[PDB]
């Protein structure tokens, strides 16, 4: 119930790969993607 202290200090120790490492960690939790029926629109 503390209120006089800033509590976003976790953003200080972020490196340049933090976002993509989190995304790679998140990749296992996701549903399979839909398919458009072709490999590419060419």
């Amino acid at each position: 119930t503390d209120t006089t202290t800033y509590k976003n200090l976790q953003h200080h120790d972020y490196n340049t790969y933090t976002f993509l490492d989190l995304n790679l960690d998140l990749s296992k939790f996701r549903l399979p993607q839909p398919s458009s029926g072709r490999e590419s629109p060419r």
Binding site: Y6, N8, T16, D21, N23, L24, R30, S36, S40
Partner: protein, 214 residues
């Protein structure tokens, strides 16, 4: 300032060595899996940004490598890399200082911040220090306007800046230590200075004010 054409140079020709690290290829695979099948062209921006984060700047070989990986046209990759302003098509320093110079930062005197930065680094805007440690440019609004004036150094925001504060940040960067982000004026975030006008009470907690029938 910049030119949206490519001239082959010995440092930026399409034979300069760029390739992703294997862990970066794993990250690229996750990025591609974030999108529906047949729409892997949606991963152009994150893969190009990953190339920039690995390499520093973005050479034409890096753009061609991103195009070759994603099987998209290299002209489409060039269109993205030239449209978006966060892509470095030329090498920058170790620290890329971006000083916001839009209207509320100008009201809170970003010009003094810019002039003291030019005096401290010995360079003009848009150019690099000769030791390749600092590039200094002006930018538009960075989305922190109540904390004006502010700069962005790489991925960090340094806010509520005075000339003494920005000189201290430059001293820490030259010394090689992190200057820590956030405001330098003694307030933690966007809160009002000299006390809080709101949110003084503790939050009410779960199940407060819930409508009946839910």
């Amino acid at each position: 300032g910049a030119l949206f054409v490519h001239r082959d140079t010995p440092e930026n020709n399409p034979d300069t060595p760029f390739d992703f690290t294997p862990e970066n290829y794993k990250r690229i695979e996750a990025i591609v899996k974030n999108y529906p099948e047949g729409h892997q062209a949606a991963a152009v921006l994150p893969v190009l940004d990953l190339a920039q984060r690995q390499n520093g700047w973005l050479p034409i070989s890096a753009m061609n490598k991103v195009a070759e990986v994603l099987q998209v046209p290299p002209m489409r990759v060039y269109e993205v890399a030239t449209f978006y302003t966060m892509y470095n098509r030329k090498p920058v320093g170790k620290y890329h200082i971006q000083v916001c110079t839009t209207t509320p930062c100008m009201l809170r005197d970003s010009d003094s911040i810019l002039e003291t930065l030019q005096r401290k680094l010995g360079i003009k805007v848009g150019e690099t220090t000769p030791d390749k440690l600092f590039t200094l440019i002006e930018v538009e609004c960075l989305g922190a306007c109540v904390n004006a004036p502010m700069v962005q150094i790489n991925d960090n925001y340094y806010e509520d800046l005075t000339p003494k504060d920005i000189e201290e940040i430059i001293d820490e960067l030259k010394a090689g230590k992190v200057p820590k982000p956030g405001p330098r004026s003694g307030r933690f975030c966007c809160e009002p200075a000299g006390g809080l006008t709101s949110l003084t009470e503790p939050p009410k907690g779960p199940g407060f004010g819930v409508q009946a029938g839910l």
